[PDB]
Ligand binder design. Sequence first.
Ligand SMILES: NC(=O)C1=CN([C@@H]2O[C@H](COP(=O)(O)OP(=O)(O)OC[C@H]3O[C@@H](n4cnc5c(N)ncnc54)[C@H](OP(=O)(O)O)[C@@H]3O)[C@@H](O)[C@H]2O)C=CC1
Ligand SMILES: NC(=O)C1=CN([C@@H]2O[C@H](COP(=O)(O)OP(=O)(O)OC[C@H]3O[C@@H](n4cnc5c(N)ncnc54)[C@H](OP(=O)(O)O)[C@@H]3O)[C@@H](O)[C@H]2O)C=CC1
Ligand SMILES: COc1cc(C[C@@H]2CO[C@@H](c3ccc(O)c(OC)c3)[C@@H]2CO)ccc1O
Ligand SMILES: COc1cc(C[C@@H]2CO[C@@H](c3ccc(O)c(OC)c3)[C@@H]2CO)ccc1O
Lengths: 309, 309
Amino acid sequence: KTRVLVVGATGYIGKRIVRACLAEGHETYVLQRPEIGLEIEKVQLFLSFKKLGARIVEGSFSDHQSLVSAVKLVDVVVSAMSGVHFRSHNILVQLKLVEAIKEAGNVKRFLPSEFGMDPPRMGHALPPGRETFDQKMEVRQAIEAAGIPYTYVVGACFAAYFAGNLSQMVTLLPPKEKVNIYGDGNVKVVFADEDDIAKYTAKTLNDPRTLNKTVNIRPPDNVLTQLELVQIWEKLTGKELEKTNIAAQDFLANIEQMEIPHQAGIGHFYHIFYEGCLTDHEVGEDEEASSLYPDVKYKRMDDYLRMFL
Amino acid sequence: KTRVLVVGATGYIGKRIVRACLAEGHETYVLQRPEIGLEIEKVQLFLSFKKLGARIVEGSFSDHQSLVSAVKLVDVVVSAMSGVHFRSHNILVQLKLVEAIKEAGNVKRFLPSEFGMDPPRMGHALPPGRETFDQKMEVRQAIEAAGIPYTYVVGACFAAYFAGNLSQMVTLLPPKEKVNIYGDGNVKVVFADEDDIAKYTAKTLNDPRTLNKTVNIRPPDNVLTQLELVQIWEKLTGKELEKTNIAAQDFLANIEQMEIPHQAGIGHFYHIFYEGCLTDHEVGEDEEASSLYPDVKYKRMDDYLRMFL
Ligand SMILES: NC(=O)C1=CN([C@@H]2O[C@H](COP(=O)(O)OP(=O)(O)OC[C@H]3O[C@@H](n4cnc5c(N)ncnc54)[C@H](OP(=O)(O)O)[C@@H]3O)[C@@H](O)[C@H]2O)C=CC1
Ligand SMILES: NC(=O)C1=CN([C@@H]2O[C@H](COP(=O)(O)OP(=O)(O)OC[C@H]3O[C@@H](n4cnc5c(N)ncnc54)[C@H](OP(=O)(O)O)[C@@H]3O)[C@@H](O)[C@H]2O)C=CC1
Ligand SMILES: COc1cc(C[C@@H]2CO[C@@H](c3ccc(O)c(OC)c3)[C@@H]2CO)ccc1O
Ligand SMILES: COc1cc(C[C@@H]2CO[C@@H](c3ccc(O)c(OC)c3)[C@@H]2CO)ccc1O
């Protein structure tokens, strides 16, 4: 019964949001852009969405009228626009989409591409990492300036990027013998399986309790220090890892001599693991997803790491 | 019981060969290379292979000993190494893998990365596209020079690249109103769903009838002219497309001014659609996959194209 349009449908979190919307029973539309011409994995992803019952809606960010038409078909718009420097960081292209939603006036709610650190709380961040949050703030201001109802989904580290590698930056796999601990390893971080993030997103987008709210993904058992996370892995494997503590000053040593996109990653890591930006404030149960949606049995990080044994 | 190592397991046809091996009941091992540790889609494909019961084998082409250890674990090695200019064209990297197989001596059968035009019939091909056939030929020679037993799988266009788009080079989707027909559109081409390619591959690799043989994938109902292909699509949509015929000379015009990848593609298309290299010769029923494996209900191009409706 709720009609949903996913923008960024073939993206990392986008494709999960699409499937979650189908499973939740939303009538699900996905935007197929003409520019994805010889990108076979995108094309075939769209084919798989259609087989599961999504509806293809052709549109382009170079064709304002195509965007107006698309969002005229649905009640809710979810954007999963890219926002990682080593991938691509086109958060501002959502501005065109805000303007199309504005012109069409039928959208009952818009979920912009957030799913990360809470932007309005990042005002002190260092560039170039800072650009992520500034751009997402700009999109927020366009949404609110336009009076578009919204939900902002924030709060958790994607497990594949922070959990599966024991938060080592070099890789996505657990380390074999040795691991770096950022500081003392006693800063609480929030970790969430991306499938759960998508499930929460599909459940909130028509939850009246979250209209015009920020929704935090902070599943209580998944608030863990890096050392706790590394110890979960030592338990599963039965092998202690040689741990080396990294003081902040040595984490950041010579950052100015590194490629921009890596500086941005280092900056994001610093806010999460050294400042603890994901756990340094309180949120109430009325604005936290696992409490809003307790039927969702989120995947705990011991189960998540097991798939790597 | 037959133990198969797939090299190139996350590639386009490779990932399908992995699943087809599992579905066939082979004990299926997949080479996980260290170099792909930061590519999230490859990493998560390996997790997904693992969940289906595939066995991860760590190895690196830059580590001759890791390869020898890897091939020693299995009865059959299948290589799906990249060989397309606008993606990646590392056919000759297989030579390091042939070396490892020769040294290890336990390997009963090797399927090199073929899966297309029959290299030994392409002596007259257009440079630079010629490279694909010269490099696979060089790999064949190393194989036979080592006395490694082989099966060469050849002879069909991948449906995604030549049928889903009605053979329009620009795209992977059917055109909306107009289509280019190459020549008179009456040259016969072989089309095959890539999942059927993978299935025939899984079935042939332990088949005595194809030891040391070329296996042709030429499913009779899928031997189609381009006009025949286009008429399938017009019958599905019920809309006639506006057709433009393109003479060979205009198709090849100014090719020497094209980017090298597009030079390659243009050349391959020419041999397929203008010279009919996939159907200019006959093959026997004892060397044709659909005849050897009539249990396989191969997908016809009308069923294939329905996905796009
Ligand atoms: N730990 C965490 O909490 C994480 C949070 N994030 C955040 O999640 C959100 C999405 O990130 P992610 O999934 O990695 O994004 P992706 O890199 O996967 O890209 C997502 C989509 O953005 C679309 N896109 C890219 N460029 C353009 C363009 N010029 N014009 C139109 N569309 C474009 C594409 O949509 P299409 O399918 O139509 O081609 C693409 O699929 C971001 O806000 C990111 O900051 C991401 C990683 C970690
Ligand atoms: N119409 C037809 O008949 C078609 C024929 N083909 C043929 O199919 C075969 C496979 O092509 P395709 O699926 O497109 O291949 P891909 O481009 O998808 O690459 C396949 C694998 O090659 C590996 N690879 C690439 N570079 C290297 C490298 N330096 N070192 C080690 N491994 C590397 C990777 O293995 P890993 O997973 O370990 O990273 C990659 O997954 C080719 O011979 C191609 O000519 C392809 C398209 C159409
Ligand atoms: C946790 O909130 C966010 C988290 C990200 C995570 C980004 C995820 O991809 C991460 C990453 C970057 C560089 C790396 O070398 C890396 O190694 C695992 C991971 C990024 C770290 O910023 C991006 C935007 C956010 O709002
Ligand atoms: C059919 O036998 C082969 C076929 C290919 C197909 C290549 C597949 O990727 C194809 C492709 C290239 C450029 C394009 O613009 C394209 O548009 C669909 C398709 C290539 C056409 O040559 C490669 C090697 C072969 O041996």
